[PDB]
Each structure stands twice: as structure tokens, then as C-alpha cells.
From Swiss-Prot, chain A:
Subcellular location: Cytoplasm; Nucleus
Post-translational modification: Proteolytically cleaved by caspases during apoptosis.
Protein name as it appears in the record: Ubiquitin conjugation factor E4 B
Part of the intact protein present: 1223 to 1300 of 1302
Domain notes: The U-box domain is required for the ubiquitin protein ligase activity.
Domain U-box: 5-78
Family: Belongs to the ubiquitin conjugation factor E4 family.
Sites bearing Phosphoserine, chain numbering: S43
Species of provenance: Homo sapiens
Record text on subunit structure and interactions: Interacts with VCP/p97. Interacts with STUB1/CHIP and UNC45B.
Tissue specificity comment: Expressed in differentiated myotubes (at protein level). Highest expression in ovary, testis, heart and skeletal muscle. Expression is low in colon, thymus and peripheral blood leukocytes. Almost undetectable in lung and spleen.
Functional summary from the UniProt entry: Ubiquitin-protein ligase that probably functions as an E3 ligase in conjunction with specific E1 and E2 ligases. May also function as an E4 ligase mediating the assembly of polyubiquitin chains on substrates ubiquitinated by another E3 ubiquitin ligase. May regulate myosin assembly in striated muscles together with STUB1 and VCP/p97 by targeting myosin chaperone UNC45B for proteasomal degradation.
Curated annotation (Swiss-Prot), chain B:
Name of the protein: Ubiquitin-conjugating enzyme E2 D3
Function: Accepts ubiquitin from the E1 complex and catalyzes its covalent attachment to other proteins. In vitro catalyzes 'Lys-11'-, as well as 'Lys-48'-linked polyubiquitination. Cooperates with the E2 CDC34 and the SCF(FBXW11) E3 ligase complex for the polyubiquitination of NFKBIA leading to its subsequent proteasomal degradation. Acts as an initiator E2, priming the phosphorylated NFKBIA target at positions 'Lys-21' and/or 'Lys-22' with a monoubiquitin. Ubiquitin chain elongation is then performed by CDC34, building ubiquitin chains from the UBE2D3-primed NFKBIA-linked ubiquitin.
Disulphides: C26-C112
Residue numbers annotated as active site: C90 (glycyl thioester intermediate)
Gene: UBE2D3
Record flagged with keyword DNA damage: yes
GO CC, alphabetical: cytosol; endosome membrane; extracellular exosome; nucleoplasm; nucleus; plasma membrane
GO biological process: apoptotic process; DNA repair; negative regulation of BMP signaling pathway; negative regulation of transcription by RNA polymerase II; positive regulation of protein targeting to mitochondrion; proteasome-mediated ubiquitin-dependent protein catabolic process; protein autoubiquitination; protein K11-linked ubiquitination
Classification of source organism: Eukaryota, Metazoa, Chordata, Craniata, Vertebrata
Membrane found in the keyword field: yes
Organism, scientific name: Homo sapiens
Membrane-protein topology: Peripheral membrane protein
UBC core domain segment(s): 6-152
Pathway: Protein modification; protein ubiquitination
Key words, A-Z: Apoptosis, ATP-binding, Cell membrane, Disulfide bond, DNA damage, DNA repair, Endosome, Membrane, Nucleotide-binding, Phosphoprotein, Transferase, Ubl conjugation pathway
Recorded GO MF terms: ATP binding; ubiquitin conjugating enzyme activity; ubiquitin protein ligase activity; ubiquitin-protein transferase activity
Length: 78, 152
């Protein structure tokens, strides 16, 4: 079953899905690697500031990931 | 497909966000049952010659939404340099200039702020574009003449 319910934040800016591999664009925006990657196939640009963007420029955000994983773990009780 | 269910999930939020927040003079909903097919309505800005008239649109969402821009156009006839007999609209936002961050709510506004101020240097209907440039009075009059018989 399971769902979300997710505390925003974890949620993707575009699709509002739960993230599984958060990354930060140069923009300072945090996106799910999966989503953003699909955007880069069409146009090599940040989907916000419309500045040039490539995979290389994506830095991972573990702090949040663990935060999500731990959250998913808590959502395994009761 | 998976990229289908996803695009849909987004479309849904957009619709839920037009309920928690309706744009200025703008209204849009699914044509019932089909989610990738919406109709939109516009109350004709009061800073335009279309003031009063109600103009209907059709929004067809790509299955790759929002990665690909939504196809949208007028059903209602309207006198404007950037809208032609078919219903086509001339907005960069709807062509090569569309960002996945853009939403329907946003687009409608972009369209209204076009009915108030048209871009005649890049016109969909040259004949009209020349009237706008040379003789505004003509334009405004005509725009209303059409808003009169077509949009009411």
C-alpha cells in the first residue's frame, strides 16, 4: 500500500514526487536526479533560471537523502 | 507508460492549484473524464477591446508533460494580430521557450497580458498587425465588433 503524505521538502519541485536521489542544481534548487535527468535530454538548461546545465553540474545532497530514508524507516511502524 | 502516470500526477496538481487559486479572469477544467484535454475560458481583459467577451480555448497535454509544452489554441474567433483563423496563439512560452517549471495557470496570464498588449513585430496575422501599428482606432473598433458578434 504505502503513500505520501510526504513532508514537501522531500518532494520534487516539478512533479512533486518523493525523491530517491536528491541533487542540487547550480541554481540552488533541489531535484530528484531521475526527473532532472529527463529534462536534460530535451534542453541542456535549468528548468527555472533557464541557465545552461549539464549532468556534471549536479551535486548530490546526501543530508536530505538520509533524512528521507530515515523518514521512510519511521513510516514502517505502527 | 510510466511517463504517462507521472505527467498525469502533475496535471492533477496543476488543476488542484487552480482551485486553491484561480488566475485573473481565467478558468480551465478537463473536458470531463479525459484529463489530458481541458477547455479554458477568458473574460476579455478590461484594458483591452475584448472587454466583456468570453473566449474559449482547448488545452491538449502532451503525454510527455510538463517536459513538452501543452498544445493550446482558441475555439472562439477573435480579432488579434497574434491569433489566426485556426485559433493558433503566438507565445514563445508555448514554443521553444517553454520550461517544465511553467504551468497552465501561468500560461493563461501570459495570454491575457497579450490581449492587452499584442506583439506586432512578430505577428500571426500581418493584415491586422499593420492596422494595429498604423491605425489603432481602427483596430480597437474592429476588435470590439468581433468581440460583439463572436464572443457574446
Amino acid at each position: 500500500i504505502d503513500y505520501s503524505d510526504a513532508p514537501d521538502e522531500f518532494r520534487d519541485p516539478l512533479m512533486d514526487t518523493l525523491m530517491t536521489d536528491p541533487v542540487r542544481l547550480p541554481s540552488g534548487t533541489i531535484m530528484d536526479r531521475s526527473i532532472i535527468l529527463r529534462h536534460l535530454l530535451n534542453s541542456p538548461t535549468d528548468p527555472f533560471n533557464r541557465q545552461t546545465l549539464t549532468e556534471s553540474m549536479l551535486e548530490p545532497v546526501p543530508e536530505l537523502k538520509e533524512q528521507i530514508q530515515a523518514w521512510m524507516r519511521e513510516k514502517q511502524n505502527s | 507508460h510510466h511517463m504517462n502516470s507521472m505527467a498525469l500526477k502533475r496535471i492533477n496538481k496543476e488543476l488542484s492549484d487552480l482551485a486553491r487559486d484561480p488566475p485573473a479572469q481565467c478558468s480551465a477544467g478537463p473536458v470531463g473524464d479525459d484529463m489530458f484535454h481541458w477547455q479554458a475560458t477568458i473574460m476579455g481583459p478590461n484594458d483591452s477591446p475584448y472587454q466583456g467577451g468570453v473566449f474559449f480555448l482547448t488545452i491538449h497535454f502532451p503525454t510527455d508533460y510538463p517536459f513538452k509544452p501543452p498544445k493550446v489554441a482558441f475555439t472562439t474567433r477573435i480579432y488579434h494580430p497574434n491569433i489566426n483563423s485556426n485559433g493558433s496563439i503566438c507565445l514563445d512560452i508555448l514554443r521553444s521557450q517553454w520550461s517544465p517549471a511553467l504551468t497552465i495557470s501561468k500560461v493563461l496570464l501570459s495570454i491575457c497580458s497579450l490581449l492587452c498588449d499584442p506583439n506586432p513585430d512578430d505577428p500571426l496575422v500581418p493584415e491586422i498587425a499593420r492596422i494595429y501599428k498604423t491605425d489603432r482606432d481602427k483596430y480597437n473598433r474592429i476588435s470590439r465588433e468581433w468581440t460583439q458578434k463572436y464572443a457574446m
